[PDB]
Amino acid sequence: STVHEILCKLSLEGDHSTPPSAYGSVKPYTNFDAERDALNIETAVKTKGVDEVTIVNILTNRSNVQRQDIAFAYQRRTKKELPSALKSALSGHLETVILGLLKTPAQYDASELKASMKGLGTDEDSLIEIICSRTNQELQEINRVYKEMYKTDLEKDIISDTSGDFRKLMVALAKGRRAEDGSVIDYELIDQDARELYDAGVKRKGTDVPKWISIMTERSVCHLQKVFERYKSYSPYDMLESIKKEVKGDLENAFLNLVQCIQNKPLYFADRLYDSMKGKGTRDKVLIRIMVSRSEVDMLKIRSEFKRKYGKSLYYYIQQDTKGDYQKALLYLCGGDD
Amino acid sequence: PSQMEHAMETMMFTFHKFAGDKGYLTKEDLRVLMEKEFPGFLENQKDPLAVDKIMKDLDQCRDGKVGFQSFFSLIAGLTIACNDYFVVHMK
């Protein structure tokens, strides 16, 4: 009964009983039809000079689930893959964005992690950004989708693409085995942990890194928030400043992001988004990954923190640091003005 | 009888268990029917209303009646879908 396999991959939609996560800036389109949207993208590509506005308006106003519907109808209608039909019709940052919007969340992270992976010698900030910010479930799917796409495990890649304690740190986080801590709260352990962090770095010259690695990978976010607080009783320095003094290089950058992630995750992206446009020009790679990856998850709150700290909305900055079709795209992903 | 014969026949009288003695397929014993048939399907689908989601749009879905023609339209959508992934993927 071979059918029993094939059939078991099949689905209606599925008509979603599921929420777009509440804090998402992107919501499931109100009256949706994948067939007409496919027509309109096709019509827009085969138009002379590539109506971009239509491709952008449609896709950035669809939720990820609807884009995958559209990209399906697009195949059976045209016999072409939508991904590469757009790869040729589009250029520059817009192409990069639209291309990423098309990938599912776990498909897009693995693709980013993979692209960043290859290098002696590679992009750790991406590696660090993704691995420090992703939850247990989010990570679990990365690994599953990484394997299916690249035939090797995300773990071996990190191993061959990293070294030292930075390797140990990124391998540990990537497992998505982090504790869940619930209602019950361990004050005994919080203290124990607070003193270990200090006993490791600041109290002594030299650093016991695996101490820091075990604690900050294993313990729950809620628990780690309390440890970082209690630590201030044993340390002249908060967790961040202590990190700066004890460790350097990729390790230090990895640790810093990690703490921010545990402390205020939306604010972490806000800072990241801010650093991307803050100079002359912009770093579009960081910007895009965040606008795409966080659009459907926490984006509203990143925006809430972004106005708090910088006094201006994210919408303001995107508008100021980018122009053209690219800008309008980032703006739809943004969700509005704060 | 060739296999295709009793396969077509199963397609026939499997509809006849849950169509009732009324002759029309209710929404409810439609739910039960589809449930009886497929082991690896309804569990995979997260939406708990999934069978009812399937009921609509299907040939004639509007009255609470689904004829054999319509149930067979379910088989059409499903079985054609299967074969496609058999081709572009398994084959």
Partner: peptide, 9 residues
Amino acid sequence: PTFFPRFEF
């Protein structure tokens, strides 16, 4: 002529 529903994945 009859009409069938659509299935992806």
